[PDB]
């Protein structure tokens, strides 16, 4: 499925994402955009054999399981597969996980470059919310 930008702000928002780590909505609505032009069947491989899964990028390397990323981790302890869904429940539940682990969202590169430190509330500008 691919999000219309509010409509993600919206499911992000009921699912509890909205100031979660202290993160605004605009923060998660931005790394959506630029981890997956909000298609949730985003699929890219890492250099290092992992794989990144679903509208938030989400690594094989420690956080889904995906059978072919040798000495990983599946913290999320869920499929990778899961993180394509057109339901984003996996996706932000283990989002929620990851953003948790120490370096906020600096853990989304695309987030550091791309999202971090500019006007994020202009993702959720309009939207009811
Ligand atoms: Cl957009
Ligand atoms: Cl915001
Ligand atoms: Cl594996
Ligand atoms: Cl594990
Ligand atoms: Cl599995
Ligand atoms: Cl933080
Ligand atoms: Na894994
Ligand atoms: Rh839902
Ligand atoms: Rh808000
Ligand atoms: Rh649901």
């Known amino acids: 499925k ?4 509010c409509e993600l702000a919206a499911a992000m928002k009921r699912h509890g994402l909205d100031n979660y780590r202290g993160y605004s909505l605009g923060n998660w609505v931005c790394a959506a955009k630029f981890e997956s032009n909000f298609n949730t069947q985003a699929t890219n491989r890492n250099t290092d054999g992992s794989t990144d899964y679903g509208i938030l990028q989400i690594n094989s390397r420690w956080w889904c399981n995906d059978g072919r990323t040798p000495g990983s981790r599946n913290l999320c302890n869920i499929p990778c597969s899961a993180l394509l869904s057109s339901d984003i429940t996996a996706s932000v539940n283990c989002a929620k996980k990851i953003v948790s ?3 906020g969202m600096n853990a989304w590169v695309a987030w550091r470059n791309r999202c971090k430190g500019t ?3 202009a993702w959720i500008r309009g939207c009811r919310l």
Do not use: C, I, K, L
């Open 101 to 103: 682990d120490g370096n």
């Open 119 to 121: 006007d994020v509330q």
């Open 2 to 5: 691919v999000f219309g930008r």
